[PDB]
Amino acid sequence: PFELSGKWITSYIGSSDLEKIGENAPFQVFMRSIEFDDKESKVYLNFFSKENGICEEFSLIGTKQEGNTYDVNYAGNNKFVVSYASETALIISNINVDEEGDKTIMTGLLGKGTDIEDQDLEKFKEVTRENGIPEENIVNIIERDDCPA
Ligand SMILES: C=C[C@H](C)CCCC(C)(C)O
C-alpha cells in the first residue's frame, strides 16, 4: 500500500525549455515535502529555490482537478500529475505556461533523500524521453541542492 504524502527531495529535473531550469531559474526546485489532502481536494508543496544565488522557501497549495491532475500558481500557471509512484520515488510531469504565454513541459524525479535507486532513475529518463525532452536537457539536482533541510 502506497503513501504519497511526506518528505520528498528532488534528484533530477528535465525541461523542454532550458531557460526555466538553470541557475536561479524558477524551475530549479529543491523539493522538501508534498502533502495530498484528498478530502479537501488540495495538495501542499514545500520547497526551496534560488534567486540571487540565495535559498528562498515556498509553501504552495494546489487544487485537485480532473484525472488526478493538480493546478497550482507558480511562475505562471501549472498543471501537473504524479505520473509514477514507487516506495522510493515519485515522478511528476508538469506543464507550465509562464507570464509571457510560453509553454514548457518538465519532469522531476523525487526521492526520500540523496541515495537514488537506478530503477526509479531509468523510469524518469523514459518518461522524460516520452515527453520529447532530450537527455542533455536533464539537470542533476542533488548535486546543486545546498539549501537547508
Ligand atoms: C519538474 C517538476 C518539479 C519537481 C515540480 C515543479 C513544481 C510544481 C510544478 C508543482 O509547481
Swiss-Prot record:
Keywords: Disulfide bond, Olfaction, Pyrrolidone carboxylic acid, Secreted, Sensory transduction, Transport. Signal peptide: none annotated. Disulfide bonds join 55-147. Belongs to the calycin superfamily. Lipocalin family. InterPro entries: Calycin, Lipocalin, Lipocln_cytosolic_FA-bd_dom, OBP-like. GO terms for cellular component: extracellular space. One of its GO terms (molecular function) is small molecule binding. This is Odorant-binding protein. SUPFAM superfamilies: Lipocalins. It holds the Pfam family Lipocalin. One of its GO terms (biological process) is sensory perception of smell. Its main location: secreted. Monomer. It is found in: Secreted. This protein is found in nasal epithelium and it binds a wide variety of chemical odorants.
